[PDB]
Design an enzyme around this catalytic site. Structure first.
Site, PDB file in Angstrom:
ATOM      1  N   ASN A   1       0.803  -1.124  -0.145  1.00 33.78           N
ATOM      2  CA  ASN A   1      -0.139  -0.027  -0.148  1.00 33.78           C
ATOM      3  C   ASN A   1       0.856   1.205  -0.063  1.00 33.78           C
ATOM      4  O   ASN A   1       0.521   2.233   0.355  1.00 33.78           O
ATOM      5  CB  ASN A   1      -0.820   0.136   1.303  1.00 33.78           C
ATOM      6  CG  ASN A   1      -0.207  -0.189   2.438  1.00 33.78           C
ATOM      7  OD1 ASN A   1       0.646   0.316   2.632  1.00 33.78           O
ATOM      8  ND2 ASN A   1      -0.950  -0.778   3.501  1.00 33.78           N
TER       9      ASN A   1
ATOM     10  N   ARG B   1       3.679   7.179  11.208  1.00 31.13           N
ATOM     11  CA  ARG B   1       3.198   6.807  12.653  1.00 31.13           C
ATOM     12  C   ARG B   1       3.152   8.055  13.376  1.00 31.13           C
ATOM     13  O   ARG B   1       3.766   8.934  13.385  1.00 31.13           O
ATOM     14  CB  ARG B   1       3.876   5.633  13.099  1.00 31.13           C
ATOM     15  CG  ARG B   1       4.176   4.404  12.350  1.00 31.13           C
ATOM     16  CD  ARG B   1       2.884   3.471  12.782  1.00 31.13           C
ATOM     17  NE  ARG B   1       2.750   2.289  12.009  1.00 31.13           N
ATOM     18  CZ  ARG B   1       2.190   1.762  10.842  1.00 31.13           C
ATOM     19  NH1 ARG B   1       1.652   2.889  10.101  1.00 31.13           N
ATOM     20  NH2 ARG B   1       2.314   0.504  10.616  1.00 31.13           N
TER      21      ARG B   1
ATOM     22  N   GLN C   1      -3.789   3.256  18.926  1.00 29.38           N
ATOM     23  CA  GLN C   1      -4.908   3.035  17.929  1.00 29.38           C
ATOM     24  C   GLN C   1      -5.814   1.946  18.535  1.00 29.38           C
ATOM     25  O   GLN C   1      -5.134   0.811  18.734  1.00 29.38           O
ATOM     26  CB  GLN C   1      -4.453   2.761  16.512  1.00 29.38           C
ATOM     27  CG  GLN C   1      -3.825   4.024  16.204  1.00 29.38           C
ATOM     28  CD  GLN C   1      -3.350   3.861  14.479  1.00 29.38           C
ATOM     29  OE1 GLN C   1      -3.158   5.082  14.095  1.00 29.38           O
ATOM     30  NE2 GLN C   1      -3.492   2.833  13.822  1.00 29.38           N
TER      31      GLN C   1
ATOM     32  N   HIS D   1      -6.995   6.020  10.650  1.00 25.33           N
ATOM     33  CA  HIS D   1      -6.020   5.313   9.914  1.00 25.33           C
ATOM     34  C   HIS D   1      -6.440   4.517   8.818  1.00 25.33           C
ATOM     35  O   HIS D   1      -6.762   3.364   8.995  1.00 25.33           O
ATOM     36  CB  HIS D   1      -5.293   4.267  11.038  1.00 25.33           C
ATOM     37  CG  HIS D   1      -3.787   3.899  10.335  1.00 25.33           C
ATOM     38  ND1 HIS D   1      -3.297   2.909  11.022  1.00 25.33           N
ATOM     39  CD2 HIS D   1      -3.377   4.060   8.978  1.00 25.33           C
ATOM     40  CE1 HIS D   1      -2.246   2.480  10.107  1.00 25.33           C
ATOM     41  NE2 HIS D   1      -2.362   3.235   9.126  1.00 25.33           N
TER      42      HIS D   1
HETATM   43  N1  LIG Z   1      -1.383   3.179   5.924  1.00 21.67           N
HETATM   44  C1  LIG Z   1      -0.549   4.073   6.533  1.00 21.67           C
HETATM   45  O1  LIG Z   1      -0.611   5.375   7.032  1.00 21.67           O
HETATM   46  C2  LIG Z   1       0.806   3.394   6.527  1.00 21.67           C
HETATM   47  C3  LIG Z   1       0.960   2.406   5.344  1.00 21.67           C
HETATM   48  C4  LIG Z   1       2.228   2.125   5.087  1.00 21.67           C
HETATM   49  C5  LIG Z   1       3.310   2.611   5.789  1.00 21.67           C
HETATM   50  N2  LIG Z   1       3.188   3.360   6.754  1.00 21.67           N
HETATM   51  C6  LIG Z   1       4.487   3.940   7.575  1.00 21.67           C
HETATM   52  O2  LIG Z   1       5.552   4.326   6.473  1.00 21.67           O
HETATM   53  C7  LIG Z   1       6.514   3.571   6.872  1.00 21.67           C
HETATM   54  C8  LIG Z   1       7.468   3.648   5.590  1.00 21.67           C
HETATM   55  O3  LIG Z   1       6.857   2.945   4.606  1.00 21.67           O
HETATM   56  P1  LIG Z   1       7.771   2.364   3.207  1.00 21.67           P
HETATM   57  O4  LIG Z   1       6.677   1.306   2.497  1.00 21.67           O
HETATM   58  O5  LIG Z   1       8.079   3.686   2.680  1.00 21.67           O
HETATM   59  O6  LIG Z   1       8.871   1.571   3.699  1.00 21.67           O
HETATM   60  P2  LIG Z   1      10.550   1.734   3.483  1.00 21.67           P
HETATM   61  O7  LIG Z   1      11.053   0.482   4.391  1.00 21.67           O
HETATM   62  O8  LIG Z   1      10.622   1.340   2.081  1.00 21.67           O
HETATM   63  O9  LIG Z   1      10.970   3.058   3.618  1.00 21.67           O
HETATM   64  C9  LIG Z   1      11.305   3.453   5.001  1.00 21.67           C
HETATM   65  C10 LIG Z   1      12.574   4.445   4.574  1.00 21.67           C
HETATM   66  O10 LIG Z   1      12.657   5.230   6.131  1.00 21.67           O
HETATM   67  C11 LIG Z   1      14.212   5.254   6.130  1.00 21.67           C
HETATM   68  N3  LIG Z   1      14.588   5.563   7.604  1.00 21.67           N
HETATM   69  C12 LIG Z   1      14.581   4.257   8.323  1.00 21.67           C
HETATM   70  N4  LIG Z   1      15.172   4.908   9.534  1.00 21.67           N
HETATM   71  C13 LIG Z   1      15.315   6.195   9.342  1.00 21.67           C
HETATM   72  C14 LIG Z   1      15.720   7.302  10.123  1.00 21.67           C
HETATM   73  N5  LIG Z   1      16.348   7.202  10.994  1.00 21.67           N
HETATM   74  N6  LIG Z   1      15.862   8.430   9.629  1.00 21.67           N
HETATM   75  C15 LIG Z   1      15.557   8.833   7.949  1.00 21.67           C
HETATM   76  N7  LIG Z   1      14.955   7.769   7.542  1.00 21.67           N
HETATM   77  C16 LIG Z   1      15.124   6.561   8.031  1.00 21.67           C
HETATM   78  C17 LIG Z   1      14.834   4.006   5.618  1.00 21.67           C
HETATM   79  O11 LIG Z   1      16.224   4.220   5.248  1.00 21.67           O
HETATM   80  C18 LIG Z   1      13.677   3.840   4.308  1.00 21.67           C
HETATM   81  O12 LIG Z   1      14.432   4.693   3.133  1.00 21.67           O
HETATM   82  C19 LIG Z   1       6.326   2.311   7.266  1.00 21.67           C
HETATM   83  O13 LIG Z   1       7.218   1.481   8.081  1.00 21.67           O
HETATM   84  C20 LIG Z   1       4.913   2.646   8.306  1.00 21.67           C
HETATM   85  O14 LIG Z   1       5.336   2.899   9.639  1.00 21.67           O
HETATM   86  C21 LIG Z   1       1.935   4.001   7.040  1.00 21.67           C
END
Ligand SMILES: NC(=O)c1ccc[n+]([C@@H]2O[C@H](COP(=O)([O-])OP(=O)(O)OC[C@H]3O[C@@H](n4cnc5c(N)ncnc54)[C@H](O)[C@@H]3O)[C@@H](O)[C@H]2O)c1
Ligand SMILES: NC(=O)c1ccc[n+]([C@@H]2O[C@H](COP(=O)([O-])OP(=O)(O)OC[C@H]3O[C@@H](n4cnc5c(N)ncnc54)[C@H](O)[C@@H]3O)[C@@H](O)[C@H]2O)c1
Lengths: 399, 399
Positions: free
Chosen positions: A146, A284, A313, A332
């Site tokens: 997603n 988050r 949540q 959410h």
């Molecule tokens: N429905 C929603 O609102 C929903 C849906 C999907 C994901 N999310 C949130 O979004 C996050 C990211 O999703 P994604 O698919 O992009 O994941 P992803 O793993 O592809 O991207 C995460 C990115 O964050 C970076 N990162 C990790 N620690 C960091 C820090 N200390 N500082 C800066 N960057 C850092 C990583 O290097 C990576 O590039 C998920 O882990 C989740 O918590 C929310």
């Protein structure tokens, strides 16, 4: 084996069998080349509501025909929940970030048969990752399912805040016209500077969606992008998140929740934002200090805040983000649009089939395996526990 | 000379001197190379509210110092309006589409000194163009001033409808959570087909903004785009608007209002849309039959409708679009964001300076001059009158 599947309630007027459209669009693969989930079969109709209790993620036929017991419930928070009664002999626990079964250290210690904690969606921070490492549990999630869905929601909320959509719709439905009241806080995004904390699957997609709006694009990440990508999008790089805030009219948060990122937006770091900045957070809720956000909107340090993610949540009925000034909140939802649900239900089945048949789970789905971070877990997370405070979800009451 | 300037009311709690941000972004020129307005000077602060009565478009000092009389009012509809009292000796009449002074044939006939009808914004359909031709009046408007502003609002509303933003925000502010209620009608736009009626300054910009969302792009126009542009965006061309509707999940209207386009969306043409299509109209309200839209949302022929434009304006307090199912309406605001107001106030001054000093008005600003269509008028419009029915705006009451 026993499989416990925590899902959210059906709609208040019942579980529907008709929808606004008849089909989903066809999608062939994800933008980095990752293939869509590959379960051997699916027992649901794409486009149906899958993530509520009566949808069951389309998993019943599959599980029962193998002799496994499926327990489906929405009852998850508090010492008397259905979840609490099934911990003692659960081998697999499934939940979605939208309605998360918090697997704290104390709960994992009560679960001696537990082998797999499965996230139906993306973001496994509602499981104590330190405890899953210590107790040799596998944590998996449905990578990419997603990410593009969420990047749409980000653009929607950036535009909604800056253009002042919500209060303007209220004037229309309430019988008014009131142009000056609507536009006293209405701007175009054209020519503004926007920065994302992280450019992963979501954050990079957000930069690509905002390029044609003629916004000046900024980012930071633990992992820097290739020079070709930076050059294609005319990206400005910042080596720390704190260097980036002062340069941006609009900031969007797209990183995972772990000890390096917990409460990163707080009273001290908000002082670094431009006066009248906009902040969007679909990553988050716990990246932000709850009360620091409210204070910044009251003073005009932030011109607006919007997101779909909260801590805990479900959010308590009187959680202050519900009623704070100039907010564009939703519950959410961005990662559980109907389109995304069909991808993550197929994904959840793919992982269960691998698990039960003794085949390896895709590396891109792994967060923790064999007493350490693994797969995407090793790329994107650090060791630690982000579940502190989650007992407060017990205070939410329906209606 | 007498200049009559019809503007909307100040905000209900008064005319502000403070704003959410301190500066507007810098913009150098428009995307096709057209330069921004070039008045000799401006007497306002960019970013201020200019289009309400107390903003005066920053025109008072300029006009009075030349010995002209400026009359500013919001009173425009009905036989006893302030506008009606000033017609007899007005040489210039200025109004904005958001709060339009309807110049019908009967009103033009009452105005023997009238030489210039000036549109502060874009779209001069609130002036009877046949009558302005017949009486040798110049009609000018501030081309491009807010075309990009409107294309932002279109994307915002497409995403808002498809993702189901408005009802989801209500669940959040009302104390709920209710995921299944929110997402029972929530989809991603990814992979959907979108078509625009017209690809002018707004419609082409909308296609460019939606390309990275991975929507399949469709259009039609009186004027076909160059082959290079069609090829760059992978556009599918349709020779008539009626051929295009059946192919689209989402339709957006971006053409001007004149006899070829008036009531083009009606009971008969809605039958050609896919079941559960989404319709967005930020062009003009009178492109749609009012009651046909309501019927289509009641049957599920349309899954949603959103726009900022209505007929007449202001819309009566009980206009049915306010309360129809699955709507994402605002009052007429996209072209009067604070950012756009500074461009069209500078433009209105540029045109007045040319006019008063006996210099030619830019060809791109002309709609009608010397008894015929001229400048952009000749490219985009046809001869006729679209003001029928506009007396109904008199029924609107404040609050
Ligand atoms: N429905 C929603 O609102 C929903 C849906 C999907 C994901 N999310 C949130 O979004 C996050 C990211 O999703 P994604 O698919 O992009 O994941 P992803 O793993 O592809 O991207 C995460 C990115 O964050 C970076 N990162 C990790 N620690 C960091 C820090 N200390 N500082 C800066 N960057 C850092 C990583 O290097 C990576 O590039 C998920 O882990 C989740 O918590 C929310
Ligand atoms: N705030 C607002 O909601 C707002 C702001 C600006 C413009 N508008 C509306 O949008 C319209 C277009 O704005 P623009 O800046 O894109 O103008 P534009 O003149 O650049 O574009 C108009 C396009 O419509 C096309 N067209 C004319 N008649 C047509 C027909 N019969 N069928 C199909 N196409 C036809 C023209 O060929 C042209 O490409 C304005 O005239 C106005 O009514 C609304």
């Amino acid at each position: 084996a026993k499989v416990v599947c925590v899902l959210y309630d059906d709609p208040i007027n019942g579980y529907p069998t008709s929808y606004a459209r008849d089909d989903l669009p066809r999608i062939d693969k994800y933008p980095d080349g990752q293939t869509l989930p590959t379960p051997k079969a699916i027992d649901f109709t794409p486009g149906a509501l899958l993530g509520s209790v009566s949808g069951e993620l389309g998993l019943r036929k599959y599980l029962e025909s193998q002799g496994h017991e499926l327990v489906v419930t929405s009852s998850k928070d508090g010492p008397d929940s259905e979840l609490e009664k099934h911990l003692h002999d659960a081998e697999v626990i499934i939940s979605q970030p939208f309605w998360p079964a918090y697997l704290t250290a104390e709960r994992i210690a009560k679960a001696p048969k537990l082998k797999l904690a499965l996230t139906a969606g993306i973001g496994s921070d509602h499981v104590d990752l330190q405890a899953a490492i210590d107790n040799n549990i596998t944590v998996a999630e449905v990578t990419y399912c997603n990410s593009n869905s969420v990047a749409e929601h980000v653009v929607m909320m950036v535009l909604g805040l800056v253009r002042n959509y919500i209060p303007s719709h209220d004037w229309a439905r309430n019988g008014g016209w009131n142009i000056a009241d609507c536009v006293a806080r209405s701007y175009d995004v054209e020519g503004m500077h926007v920065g994302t904390v992280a450019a992963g699957r979501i954050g990079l997609r957000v930069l690509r969606l905002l390029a044609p709006f003629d916004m000046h694009l900024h980012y930071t990440d633990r992992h820097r992008l290739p020079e070709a990508v930076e050059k294609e999008l005319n990206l400005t790089w910042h080596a720390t998140r704190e260097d980036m805030y002062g340069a941006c009219d609009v900031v969007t948060l797209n990183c995972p929740l772990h000890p390096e990122t917990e409460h990163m937006i707080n009273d001290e770091t908000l002082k670094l934002f431009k006066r009248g900045a906009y902040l969007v957070n679909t990553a988050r809720g716990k990246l932000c200090d709850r009360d620091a956000i409210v204070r910044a909107l009251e003073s005009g340090r932030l011109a607006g805040y919007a997101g779909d993610v909260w801590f805990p949540q479900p959010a308590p009925n009187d959680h202050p983000w519900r009623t704070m000034p100039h907010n564009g909140m939703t519950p959410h939802i961005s990662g559980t649009s109907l389109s995304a649900q069909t991808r993550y239900a197929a994904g959840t089945r793919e992982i269960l089939e691998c698990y039960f048949e003794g085949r390896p789970i895709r590396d891109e789905y792994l967060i923790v395996q064999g007493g350490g971070l693994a797969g995407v877990g090793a790329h994107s997370y650090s060791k630690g526990n982000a579940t502190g405070g989650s007992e407060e979800a017990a205070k939410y009451e329906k209606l």
